């Protein structure tokens, strides 16, 4: 299938350059157009520019006309991005997407967030929320882990490495001192916890890591 | 730069009803091959977009058929017929016929459905926290509807307002319901000075509060 492995996190110095890049896979490269999309959080979605990789031809959004330089790699089917004098307007999801015939974006990457600030890259701790001894469960109980002390965005949270996914609620982070919390909590029927195992994973790709934790009673 | 209008900004829709997503563009944008290169997206809640519709009123392969495009000139539409709860999210229209490519406003499909009460599960720092000088206390609320509703804290029977921060889940995919944290961090310090820890969660579909409270026995 058609396919955009992204760079996933990124954290920068105002004033810096960084580089993104979008390894295509499941169609042949050089046929096709790719292109970059900006989302700032909460914001909508704004076209940067294209490159076709087949003669390296490039166009632009003019707004990024000093800001973005596309290029490409035939060999490794990769597209970049590099984004020069980086400033908090620049924090944003980018996304690479392909554009076929008669039509766009038919399949987009997963987004590269960029962060911009002077602040350095933190991975989580992270947290069991289990009930209180004496707590009476009806038929389901509640259960989560605590992303606490990160940055930059995002964290991603997995239950049972997927395999979970009926009843998990992951809430909107939160920001507190130049640090992100979120959590993560899953429902399952009181009968089968602790019983049965039940893992959280969570991701934090600006520092590479996933954390895998068994979450048991207190 | 050709500027795509739409509206409404945002769109409550009971399941199984009809939404009606307008997109007006600045000026014409029909290319000079004839075709007009207006499409239709979709983004989830933290997923990519999707695409839906292209020149217009054309379905994009495995697209359900209760979605449909229309329009000319500069004035479009997107239906979607016999709303399900996961077309929840973000719908854009685009035009790819003058650089730069535009992307509209965005429209918010939002599900409206029956009132929902919360569950409430209170959970007290975990004694792995300890160690990093702050303790947690987290409130949870589960499944509920609307997304408005008021979280109170109380410390041994005194209510308190520093130090607590709120997170909401988007809309379920599948109940339709919300869910929140309220969680109150603490130091270790002041955590370990008191004895009852009480979130009350008040929504509009009882008058009665939910109180879940522990203490470190």
Known sequence: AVQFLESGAELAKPGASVKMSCKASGYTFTTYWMHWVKQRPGQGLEWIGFISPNTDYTEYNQKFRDKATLTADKSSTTAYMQLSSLTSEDSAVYYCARS???YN??????GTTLTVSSATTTAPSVYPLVPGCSDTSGSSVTLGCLVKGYFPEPVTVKWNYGALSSGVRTVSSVLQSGFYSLSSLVTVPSSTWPSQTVICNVAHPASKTELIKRIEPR | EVLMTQTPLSLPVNLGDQASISCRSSQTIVYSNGNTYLEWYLQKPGQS???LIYKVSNRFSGVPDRFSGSGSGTDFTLKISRVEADDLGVYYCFQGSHVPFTFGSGTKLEIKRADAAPTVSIF?????????????????????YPKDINVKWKIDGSERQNGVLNGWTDQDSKDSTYSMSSTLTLTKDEYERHNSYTCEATHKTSTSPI???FNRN
């Open chain 1, 100 to 102: 076929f015939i008669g």
């Open chain 1, 105 to 110: 974006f038919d399949f987009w990457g997963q």
């Open chain 2, 49 to 51: 977009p999707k695409l």
């Open chain 2, 124 to 144: 007290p720092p975990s004694s792995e926290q300890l160690t990093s000088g702050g303790a947690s206390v987290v409130c949870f609320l589960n499944n509920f």
């Open chain 2, 211 to 213: 109180v879940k409270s």
